[PDB]
Amino acid sequence: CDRYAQPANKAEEYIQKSVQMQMKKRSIPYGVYTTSCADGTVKGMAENARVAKESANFRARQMSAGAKAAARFNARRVANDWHNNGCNYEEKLTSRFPAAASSVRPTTNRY
Amino acid sequence: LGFYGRKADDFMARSIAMQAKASAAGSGVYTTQCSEGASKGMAENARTASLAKQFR
Amino acid sequence: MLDAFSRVVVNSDAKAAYVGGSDLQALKSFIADGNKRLDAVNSIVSNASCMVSDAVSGMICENPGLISPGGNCYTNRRMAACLRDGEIILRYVSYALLAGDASVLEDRCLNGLKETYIALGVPTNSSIRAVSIMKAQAVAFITNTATERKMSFAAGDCTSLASEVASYFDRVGAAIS
Amino acid sequence: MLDAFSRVVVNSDAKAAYVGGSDLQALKSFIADGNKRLDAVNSIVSNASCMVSDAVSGMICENPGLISPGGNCYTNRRMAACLRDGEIILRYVSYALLAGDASVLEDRCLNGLKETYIALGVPTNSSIRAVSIMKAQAVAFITNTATERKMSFAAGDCTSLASEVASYFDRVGAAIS
Amino acid sequence: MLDAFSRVVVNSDAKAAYVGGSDLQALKSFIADGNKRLDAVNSIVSNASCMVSDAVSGMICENPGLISPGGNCYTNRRMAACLRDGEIILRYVSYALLAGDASVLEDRCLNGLKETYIALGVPTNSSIRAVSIMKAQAVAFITNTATERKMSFAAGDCTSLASEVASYFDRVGAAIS
Amino acid sequence: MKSVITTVVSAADAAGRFPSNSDLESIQGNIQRSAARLEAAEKLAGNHEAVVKEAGDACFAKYAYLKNPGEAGENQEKINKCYRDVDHYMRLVNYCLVVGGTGPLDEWGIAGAREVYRTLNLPTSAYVASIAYTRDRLCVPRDMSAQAGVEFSAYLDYLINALS
Amino acid sequence: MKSVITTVVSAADAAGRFPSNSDLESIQGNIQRSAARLEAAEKLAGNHEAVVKEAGDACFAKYAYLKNPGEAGENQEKINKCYRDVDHYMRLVNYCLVVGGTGPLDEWGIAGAREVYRTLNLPTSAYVASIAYTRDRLCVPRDMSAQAGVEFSAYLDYLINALS
Amino acid sequence: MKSVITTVVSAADAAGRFPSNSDLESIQGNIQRSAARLEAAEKLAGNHEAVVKEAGDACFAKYAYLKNPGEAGENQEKINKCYRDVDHYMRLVNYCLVVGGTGPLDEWGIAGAREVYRTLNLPTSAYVASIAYTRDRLCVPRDMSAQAGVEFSAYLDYLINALS
Amino acid sequence: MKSVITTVVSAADAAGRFPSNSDLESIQGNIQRSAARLEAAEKLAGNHEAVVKEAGDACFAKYAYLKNPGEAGENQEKINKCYRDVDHYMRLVNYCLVVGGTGPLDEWGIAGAREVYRTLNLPTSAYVASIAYTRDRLCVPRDMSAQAGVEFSAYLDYLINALS
Ligand SMILES: C=CC1=C(C)[C@@H](Cc2[nH]c(/C=C3N=C(/C=C4/NC(=O)[C@H](C)[C@H]4CC)C(C)=C/3CCC(=O)O)c(CCC(=O)O)c2C)NC1=O
Ligand SMILES: C=CC1=C(C)[C@@H](Cc2[nH]c(/C=C3N=C(/C=C4/NC(=O)[C@H](C)[C@H]4CC)C(C)=C/3CCC(=O)O)c(CCC(=O)O)c2C)NC1=O
Ligand SMILES: C=CC1=C(C)[C@@H](Cc2[nH]c(/C=C3N=C(/C=C4/NC(=O)[C@H](C)[C@H]4CC)C(C)=C/3CCC(=O)O)c(CCC(=O)O)c2C)NC1=O
Ligand SMILES: C=CC1=C(C)[C@@H](Cc2[nH]c(/C=C3N=C(/C=C4\NC(=O)[C@H](C)[C@H]4CC)C(C)=C\3CCC(=O)O)c(CCC(=O)O)c2C)NC1=O
Ligand SMILES: C=CC1=C(C)[C@@H](Cc2[nH]c(/C=C3N=C(/C=C4\NC(=O)[C@H](C)[C@H]4CC)C(C)=C\3CCC(=O)O)c(CCC(=O)O)c2C)NC1=O
Ligand SMILES: C=CC1=C(C)[C@@H](Cc2[nH]c(/C=C3N=C(/C=C4\NC(=O)[C@H](C)[C@H]4CC)C(C)=C\3CCC(=O)O)c(CCC(=O)O)c2C)NC1=O
Ligand SMILES: C=CC1=C(C)[C@@H](Cc2[nH]c(/C=C3N=C(/C=C4\NC(=O)[C@H](C)[C@H]4CC)C(C)=C\3CCC(=O)O)c(CCC(=O)O)c2C)NC1=O
Ligand SMILES: C=CC1=C(C)[C@@H](Cc2[nH]c(/C=C3N=C(/C=C4\NC(=O)[C@H](C)[C@H]4CC)C(C)=C\3CCC(=O)O)c(CCC(=O)O)c2C)NC1=O
Ligand SMILES: C=CC1=C(C)[C@@H](Cc2[nH]c(/C=C3N=C(/C=C4\NC(=O)[C@H](C)[C@H]4CC)C(C)=C\3CCC(=O)O)c(CCC(=O)O)c2C)NC1=O
Ligand SMILES: C=CC1=C(C)[C@@H](Cc2[nH]c(/C=C3N=C(/C=C4\NC(=O)[C@H](C)[C@H]4CC)C(C)=C\3CCC(=O)O)c(CCC(=O)O)c2C)NC1=O
Ligand SMILES: C=CC1=C(C)[C@@H](Cc2[nH]c(/C=C3N=C(/C=C4\NC(=O)[C@H](C)[C@H]4CC)C(C)=C\3CCC(=O)O)c(CCC(=O)O)c2C)NC1=O
Ligand SMILES: C=CC1=C(C)[C@@H](Cc2[nH]c(/C=C3N=C(/C=C4\NC(=O)[C@H](C)[C@H]4CC)C(C)=C\3CCC(=O)O)c(CCC(=O)O)c2C)NC1=O
Ligand SMILES: C=CC1=C(C)[C@@H](Cc2[nH]c(/C=C3N=C(/C=C4\NC(=O)[C@H](C)[C@H]4CC)C(C)=C\3CCC(=O)O)c(CCC(=O)O)c2C)NC1=O
Ligand SMILES: C=CC1=C(C)[C@@H](Cc2[nH]c(/C=C3N=C(/C=C4\NC(=O)[C@H](C)[C@H]4CC)C(C)=C\3CCC(=O)O)c(CCC(=O)O)c2C)NC1=O
């Protein structure tokens, strides 16, 4: 999933960041912001949604050493087999960068 | 696809989620990848995040 | 996601119409009251804590049937959700009086809102009561006709925007009925 | 979710009833029969692999129409879901026997469960037969009237839990009817 | 993950050994001390917002370097992020005493805790100062040497818990350093 | 809700699992100290009209600014609603001595308290300090038993803790 | 849709937030240059039959290969549909002078234009170059005001930019 | 791991939430019946060489087919490993009387037991029935206390239940 | 009685016709209905001690003038006489859920009763509060099965059409 597989270097997190930008571009297809990344209604939950992920971003690199090692083999188990079939370039992008291929989120849930 | 089919449909997917909440807690841990809050309690505030997602 | 500058556009597209000067004087009077609408909506967002304050105050003033336990609206987490639901209509019609148009209401809360309320046991007769308090203070806030709070203004007619906010909250009041 | 310590407060919260010692003594019998209540629930979780092999074998003993192919319950994956559905109803009544209350049965199992079975095609009559074997062996397990299996106990009357477990299994049966 | 019950079974696991009648007399102190351990843990969790407001004020007592603008901890969300981090040492050092072991403390916060703080620019000297305030107020709450707060107790020693809680805040002080 | 029934019969369902003896053990601690917990409940049921009035103007002594127009206590109609407001907090704390945990507090009177009060220009600092007046207002071998005040006093400073 | 209303009332909903003065400021720039924007709209409403015909065979001068059978312009029935096709582009650009942004362009006449045309063997190179004929076809102090052409001309080279 | 510490300090982290009094209540049931739980542990520590030998040929009485070549018990070298195999089950059940739940069972000796045994042609039916010999092999007021056997016997039929 | 089966028997005697499958139709229609109908028909014999001190005095909570001279509570043995007419009027409700029709009542209860009660001068508008408490205390998916308390209402307020 997102925010659970930790990147190793600056190079992995940057293309992890860049594939998230197209998932912004999917859910924000044009100049209107969608109704579905609204993540809040009141002033209290506006900044609560920001500090919720930053504790969960820490709990990726906090929890273990082998389950997060199993994540980087698991990240090819969603992308290689049912997201980028036929593209070898997009296949070795997973096996060279699993944490970048883990927030690619092609389950179009408009988020 | 039916009123009877519509009220059927949310029950097994609740059971699909409770199947899959029981693979997260295969071993009996609420495992740390699932997070649904902050430091301050605010999961009743993140109830209103998720019930907005229930509503939107 | 639709406004007063886009409402007259989509009605030209049932008829493929090139918009010339026959209708734009209604739009040239919409750009006349741009700052007048902006002086109106600056007075609404001035005391937007006070508008949600006065609504559920005067709604529990008339009906203690909610505050009786075993009823709906007796308790504070419910009144949290009630003052979640209270401000959101005020937060959404402030987008609408900004727009000169009620289309931004018409999908962001106005879909599904009446039958979600019957799924939780929400009495809709209190909802049409509290929006009437919300209607009555807001027309007394776009003008200079509050009790104590008089902002500084250039004076003149503000009843055209008062007809717009009066046509907004009853459309809420018909969609919650 | 909700239990016998919390059953006596939700009728008292609905009347704003400050709880005093007029209804405490029914809970004080539940206080005094704490260890008697746990005495029945450890004879029912200690043979739960026996009962799931006793009931649907006893259900296929009485009616061989399901193992006929083209019937409901005949093949190998199909029998895996028979032990799947059959064990999970024993998990929920063992929750319900402990609370002094079948409320935790009523929400996690007993919502919509009946017509999911006929949106599948489960015969509901065979599920009344399987739950009645599970009613009849479990009342023989909370006492000492089993065939071979006698655990060590402290003697006396314990029919008050046998009336409790018989008022639970028909609540399963009336839900799937 | 693992209480002070179970420190003595994972080393017997490594020898293919079992917990014979020589190692668990400290455990038969540890089960006979069930209600003296319980009489310390109400005294910490009753005044939990005292101790996070006594630590961060005593930290800004000794150090006006963070209150300067451009420092670590001076502004609004930032000091709000302190009361996130100020309680979470107190949050898991409760469970270090509740379980009896700091193994519930060792994986759940102490993994990667020091390297995030240099990645967030947090100075570790103010972190190890504020936890020494949290040690000094917790040993005066499990005992009877507070200023004004006088809870009811039964007399006897609990210096065995005072040495257990002193071996806990040093362990988090070695892991944030 | 929130009790030990909400812990162990929910975690066994969250594990998809039997009520094993971890779950059967957790309710035994109810039984040995329900007698400790439930002579505290009829104290504030016996004083359900006694200590609401002594807490309001103890709060309004240290918050005496409210009586001006334009604030939270501008007339007696506010103060007629204000003794309703402390009693509605006081109803729930009585019920948490019965269910064991803070069951009726969080889902009814605690969650989203920080979205209501100063939006209705009600001061939250007077709300915890009216409760903190009643927090130290106890005398453990004299009013109730010594086994009764430690459930009472731990819920009242929790009310300041849950507003934090 | 696509306007400044689609920016700030949607971003305040995407933040779950009030219409603060960041949102109230963004529509003030509509008001001071709607008079700049809306004498351009009645030009191409006044020339809605004038410049459709002058753009078709200016395109068909530099794309004169179409008249053979088996291509996109094999008969006059194609050319009767072809003046419909440039005018349907020309309808939307008139509407984007009214809504401010390119509102009716992207959700109606731009998105998925690169899944249609050469699949229907229609040349996309003639589509941008018929528009690029009309892009430079302006004269800013003579046809309209000087404050009117810079909204017009920035939308026409956008039509080549949005097909890229 | 698997205990009540694995329930409530993990669910408060899964809610992103304080250790509230729902979490503080759940461990009180450890304290009142750890004395019930931990005179059972030194029984099978005192009988860690006594009941391994009495369970092997009680299993090998009702599974006496193994001694042929080509099967799971073709020599004494298998039987020298076989008393290791029941004792390695017997080590973990002793540890689950200490941690409360079935902590050392599931993550070490239960999960993926149904991917190993008949792949190594080891019969799983003899594995549960060697354990089911020891399941009824108890006498609650005579061997241990009456408060000690109900943690022991509920873990042994669980071993047949977890292989199901 | 007017039962589920007894309708088509006299209809077979009316024309000289036979039982067809439409005469056989509603016997399935009761056995598809009564999978939970006998739960509340058992619970009318299963809750009949708390409800005789609920519904026997639910008349007396509203009709407080029954201790007037000239009424049913001037003497103590006539306070028994209204209580058996809740005790028989929950044993006949126990007898009315099982027939299908109003079988006990149209032979014994309604049989002349509009003539009966005003010459003995017993108020039949005071008999409704013995039945009205059995119409609002009904929370169906906690007391009975969820279908079963809907049909239990329908026999119960048909008596209200007889008295009023
Ligand atoms: C549930 C909360 C609750 C309360 C707090 C009381 C509130 C209360 N407490 C006291 C009872 C009191 N009793 C004492 C005596 C004491 N002797 C000592 O050695 C101690 C220092 C001190 C224990 C506080 C004091 C100081 C008061 C408060 C002052 C007063 O008498 O009103 C009284 C006066 C009448 C009486 O004595 O009972 C009242 C109305 N009632 C309630 O229902
Ligand atoms: C919305 C788009 C739109 C258009 C472009 C015009 C199209 C158009 N423009 C011109 C008007 C024109 N006026 C000029 C004169 C000019 N003098 C100068 O100093 C400049 C170099 C140059 C500005 C282009 C030229 C070169 C033409 C095009 C040739 C022509 O006259 O047809 C004419 C001829 C009649 C007239 O003069 O109005 C037409 C039909 N109409 C429209 O509705
Ligand atoms: C943790 C598991 C564990 C065990 C089961 C025992 C195993 C075991 N139990 C018994 C003890 C026994 N004691 C009895 C007597 C009894 N009297 C009654 O009224 C009952 C019916 C019955 C309780 C079983 C019987 C039948 C046996 C087993 C047969 C035997 O004596 O070997 C003996 C013989 C020596 C002795 O008496 O202690 C042994 C080796 N040890 C262990 O460590
Ligand atoms: C770094 C992580 C990374 C991936 C795992 C892949 C997967 C991927 N491809 C596309 C997007 C695309 N992906 C392809 C790729 C292909 N189409 C084919 O016909 C071939 C079989 C296959 C490999 C050549 C194409 C042509 C597009 C553009 C059209 C589209 O949106 O699908 C997108 C959406 C936005 C984007 O381009 O990133 C993603 C996530 N691309 C990535 O950047
Ligand atoms: C019994 C309980 C009770 C109350 C709590 C008040 C609440 C209250 N206020 C108003 C009515 C109003 N309330 C306001 C709002 C405000 N006025 C101000 O001075 C502030 C600036 C701002 C709150 C921050 C306005 C502007 C009106 C319209 C008339 C007026 O000016 O008072 C109404 C009438 C609503 C309607 O007409 O539909 C009610 C019931 N009145 C009551 O009867
Ligand atoms: C045959 C049908 C049948 C009934 C209609 C009830 C009738 C009934 N209800 C209660 C008693 C009760 N019944 C409830 C439950 C409820 N209170 C409410 O506010 C809700 C409407 C409802 C479901 C949530 C509660 C909370 C009590 C105890 C406290 C009280 O009386 O309010 C009692 C007293 C003894 C007991 O607890 O069982 C009885 C006899 N029982 C039955 O067997
Ligand atoms: C022809 C097919 C056929 C079967 C497969 C069995 C299955 C079976 N068992 C019981 C009935 C029972 N089954 C058990 C269960 C058990 N008894 C034990 O000795 C073990 C300890 C445990 C299995 C592990 C119990 C306790 C009863 C109650 C009566 C009894 O003691 O036998 C019933 C009757 C259920 C009822 O009355 O509603 C049936 C059909 N019997 C059959 O006729
Ligand atoms: C968590 C694990 C756990 C258990 C397994 C039980 C075990 C158990 N049951 C009983 C004790 C008893 N149990 C029963 C009930 C029964 N007795 C029978 O013979 C029937 C099999 C059954 C009917 C349901 C009776 C009638 C007593 C006697 C009460 C007494 O001895 O005072 C006692 C004595 C304590 C007492 O109730 O006073 C104990 C410890 N308790 C626990 O805490
Ligand atoms: C310059 C500013 C300044 C402050 C803000 C306070 C803060 C403060 N408190 C304590 C020290 C302490 N603080 C507490 C906490 C409390 N004591 C109570 O009476 C309450 C019940 C509870 C707050 C809710 C306790 C129990 C101690 C231990 C010694 C003591 O009892 O005072 C210490 C010493 C820490 C140490 O020695 O390591 C400091 C700096 N003191 C200061 O010098
Ligand atoms: C539900 C929650 C719950 C509790 C809070 C405890 C409450 C509690 N604490 C103690 C009892 C005690 N508690 C302590 C501990 C202390 N005494 C002091 O004066 C120091 C301040 C502190 C050091 C930490 C001591 C020394 C005893 C006396 C032990 C004894 O009397 O044998 C006892 C008497 C039982 C005993 O230990 O013998 C009880 C019931 N039990 C519970 O079930
Ligand atoms: C059942 C849960 C429950 C609570 C926890 C309280 C909390 C609470 N109080 C108020 C509402 C109020 N609460 C107060 C009370 C006070 N204002 C102060 O500044 C003083 C400190 C204090 C008096 C001692 C007042 C005066 C109002 C009315 C505010 C207004 O209408 O303007 C409201 C809004 C709805 C209502 O009017 O009831 C809520 C949820 N009330 C509840 O119903
Ligand atoms: C409202 C939005 C809208 C548009 C943006 C255009 C775009 C467009 N044009 C055509 C369709 C067409 N467009 C053209 C036009 C041309 N072919 C050329 O090569 C020349 C450059 C040009 C004439 C000047 C022709 C000839 C067809 C018909 C193609 C065919 O049927 O084979 C179609 C397919 C459906 C249809 O026939 O309308 C679409 C979507 N039409 C629209 O309805
Ligand atoms: C710590 C966890 C742990 C366990 C739960 C057991 C389970 C287990 N047993 C064996 C392995 C074995 N287990 C057995 C035992 C038996 N075969 C039978 O049919 C009899 C029923 C029984 C003897 C009484 C034998 C004979 C082997 C060796 C199989 C072989 O090498 O062919 C293995 C493969 C690795 C190994 O050789 O150890 C494992 C994981 N052993 C463990 O280390
Ligand atoms: C088996 C069939 C059967 C019934 C259908 C019911 C109905 C019923 N109630 C009464 C009989 C009665 N019912 C009442 C009751 C009341 N009078 C009033 O004024 C109040 C409205 C109400 C108070 C509760 C009294 C007082 C009598 C006896 C008449 C008398 O002695 O005065 C009788 C007359 C015969 C008898 O004494 O039982 C019958 C048939 N009870 C039954 O046993």
Automatic annotation (TrEMBL), chain A:
It comes from the Eukaryota. This is R-phycoerythrin gamma chain, chloroplastic. It comes from Porphyridium purpureum (Red alga). The lineage of its organism: Eukaryota, Rhodophyta, Bangiophyceae, Porphyridiales, Porphyridiaceae. The chain holds residues 223 to 333 of 333 of the full protein.
TrEMBL record, chains F, G, H, I:
Coiled coil: none annotated. It comes from the Eukaryota. GO terms for biological process: photosynthesis. Keywords: Antenna complex, Bile pigment, Chloroplast, Chromophore, Electron transport, Membrane, Photosynthesis, Phycobilisome, Plastid, Thylakoid, Transport. InterPro entries: Globin-like_sf (IPR009050), Phycobilisome_asu/bsu (IPR012128), Phycobilisome_asu/bsu_sf (IPR038719). One of its GO terms (cellular component) is phycobilisome. It is a peripheral membrane protein. SUPFAM superfamilies: Globin-like (SSF46458). The keyword Thylakoid applies. (2R,3E)-phycocyanobilin binds at C82. It is found in: Plastid, Chloroplast thylakoid membrane. PANTHER family: C-PHYCOCYANIN ALPHA SUBUNIT (PTHR34011:SF4), PHYCOBILISOME 32.1 KDA LINKER POLYPEPTIDE, PHYCOCYANIN-ASSOCIATED, ROD 2-RELATED (PTHR34011). This is Phycoerythrin alpha subunit. The gene is peA.
